[PDB]
Design an enzyme around this catalytic site. Sequence first.
Site, mmCIF file in Angstrom:
data_model
loop_
_atom_site.group_PDB
_atom_site.id
_atom_site.type_symbol
_atom_site.label_atom_id
_atom_site.label_comp_id
_atom_site.label_asym_id
_atom_site.label_seq_id
_atom_site.Cartn_x
_atom_site.Cartn_y
_atom_site.Cartn_z
ATOM 1 N N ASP A 20 0.847 -1.191 0.000
ATOM 2 C CA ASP A 20 0.000 0.000 0.000
ATOM 3 C C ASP A 20 0.883 1.242 0.000
ATOM 4 O O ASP A 20 1.386 1.656 1.049
ATOM 5 C CB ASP A 20 -0.934 -0.022 1.209
ATOM 6 N N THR A 21 1.068 1.836 -1.181
ATOM 7 C CA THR A 21 1.833 3.073 -1.282
ATOM 8 C C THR A 21 1.093 4.261 -0.680
ATOM 9 O O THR A 21 1.715 5.296 -0.422
ATOM 10 C CB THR A 21 2.175 3.365 -2.744
ATOM 11 N N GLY A 22 -0.211 4.137 -0.454
ATOM 12 C CA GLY A 22 -0.989 5.169 0.191
ATOM 13 C C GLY A 22 -0.976 5.116 1.698
ATOM 14 O O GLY A 22 -1.664 5.910 2.347
HETATM 15 C C1 LIG Z 1 -6.916 7.012 2.747
HETATM 16 C C2 LIG Z 1 -5.424 6.728 2.542
HETATM 17 C C3 LIG Z 1 -4.609 8.000 2.274
HETATM 18 C C4 LIG Z 1 -4.828 5.977 3.748
HETATM 19 N N1 LIG Z 1 -5.078 4.521 3.731
HETATM 20 C C5 LIG Z 1 -4.364 3.732 2.718
HETATM 21 C C6 LIG Z 1 -5.261 3.226 1.575
HETATM 22 O O1 LIG Z 1 -4.450 2.646 0.548
HETATM 23 C C7 LIG Z 1 -6.413 2.280 1.973
HETATM 24 C C8 LIG Z 1 -5.980 0.835 2.290
HETATM 25 C C9 LIG Z 1 -7.164 -0.016 2.677
HETATM 26 C C10 LIG Z 1 -7.633 -1.024 1.832
HETATM 27 C C11 LIG Z 1 -8.728 -1.771 2.231
HETATM 28 F F1 LIG Z 1 -9.177 -2.752 1.408
HETATM 29 C C12 LIG Z 1 -9.383 -1.560 3.433
HETATM 30 C C13 LIG Z 1 -8.884 -0.546 4.240
HETATM 31 F F2 LIG Z 1 -9.482 -0.296 5.424
HETATM 32 C C14 LIG Z 1 -7.799 0.229 3.895
HETATM 33 N N2 LIG Z 1 -7.372 2.258 0.877
HETATM 34 C C15 LIG Z 1 -8.634 2.755 0.923
HETATM 35 O O2 LIG Z 1 -9.213 3.217 1.886
HETATM 36 O O3 LIG Z 1 -9.140 2.635 -0.336
HETATM 37 C C16 LIG Z 1 -10.556 2.753 -0.577
HETATM 38 C C17 LIG Z 1 -10.677 3.199 -2.027
HETATM 39 O O4 LIG Z 1 -10.488 1.999 -2.779
HETATM 40 C C18 LIG Z 1 -11.225 0.965 -2.112
HETATM 41 O O5 LIG Z 1 -10.566 -0.262 -2.194
HETATM 42 C C19 LIG Z 1 -9.811 -0.464 -0.983
HETATM 43 C C20 LIG Z 1 -10.642 0.203 0.110
HETATM 44 C C21 LIG Z 1 -11.295 1.393 -0.610
HETATM 45 S S1 LIG Z 1 -5.427 3.773 5.206
HETATM 46 O O6 LIG Z 1 -5.376 2.329 4.991
HETATM 47 O O7 LIG Z 1 -6.646 4.411 5.677
HETATM 48 C C22 LIG Z 1 -4.106 4.126 6.376
HETATM 49 C C23 LIG Z 1 -2.909 3.409 6.309
HETATM 50 C C24 LIG Z 1 -1.902 3.693 7.224
HETATM 51 C C25 LIG Z 1 -2.076 4.677 8.201
HETATM 52 C C26 LIG Z 1 -0.974 4.980 9.198
HETATM 53 C C27 LIG Z 1 -0.634 3.759 10.043
HETATM 54 O O8 LIG Z 1 0.242 5.371 8.559
HETATM 55 C C28 LIG Z 1 -3.283 5.379 8.251
HETATM 56 C C29 LIG Z 1 -4.300 5.108 7.345
#
Ligand SMILES: CC(C)CN(C[C@@H](O)[C@H](Cc1cc(F)cc(F)c1)NC(=O)O[C@H]1CO[C@H]2OCC[C@H]21)S(=O)(=O)c1ccc([C@@H](C)O)cc1
Lengths: 99, 99
Positions: A25-27
């Site tokens: 997860d690059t995000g």
């Molecule tokens: C909102 C971003 C900037 C941060 N996030 C990273 C994203 O990559 C998430 C990953 C994800 C995947 C998933 F399947 C479930 C889930 F709960 C999270 N993606 C996401 O929400 O995507 C949406 C849109 O696409 C859809 O498919 C996938 C789910 C749906 S984060 O995980 O909140 C997060 C990580 C780390 C920290 C700290 C510890 O550093 C804080 C927060």
Amino acid sequence: PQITLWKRPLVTIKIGGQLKEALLDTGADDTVLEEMNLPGRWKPKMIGGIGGFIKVRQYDQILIEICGHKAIGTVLVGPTPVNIIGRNLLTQIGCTLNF
Amino acid sequence: PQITLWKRPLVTIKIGGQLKEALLDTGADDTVLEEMNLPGRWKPKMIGGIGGFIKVRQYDQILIEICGHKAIGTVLVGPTPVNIIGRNLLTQIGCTLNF
Ligand SMILES: CC(C)CN(C[C@@H](O)[C@H](Cc1cc(F)cc(F)c1)NC(=O)O[C@H]1CO[C@H]2OCC[C@H]21)S(=O)(=O)c1ccc([C@@H](C)O)cc1
């Protein structure tokens, strides 16, 4: 290897003698794992994403073997829906985006 | 190009004649943008993340210029903390993971 994004970029990880599959997860700034059996001391912390915040346990200097590449860093443990490998550990295995 | 992940992988995108900055997020299956005024009809939807779910508007066949690379696909707009470029659009610009 090189990973296309046509499917979820899931990898097999080895952490605490336990095998799991996690999302590259690059995000994600940091690594967050679903609740699991981890040894050692920790300090409470909370992380926020889409939909709000969750309370996690913060573990430091945790060994994790990600697809055969070993890295040590902070791992957060809490009610995440999916295991996500964040940039704190991706940088250690030399992971880059390429387009 | 090639992007290391020591910092957030933020890029300049152009969508609806507006310039914004978005996170190249391999952990997102879908593109979600901070609140903005996009042209056309839309459809209610619910998406889930780390903290729970948010209500977003689904806009289809939206043109987006990602760091000079053009893509058309579904774009969701709602109370996301950050603009996210998901795998539905990353695959169209030829983005790959590399480790
Ligand atoms: C909102 C971003 C900037 C941060 N996030 C990273 C994203 O990559 C998430 C990953 C994800 C995947 C998933 F399947 C479930 C889930 F709960 C999270 N993606 C996401 O929400 O995507 C949406 C849109 O696409 C859809 O498919 C996938 C789910 C749906 S984060 O995980 O909140 C997060 C990580 C780390 C920290 C700290 C510890 O550093 C804080 C927060």
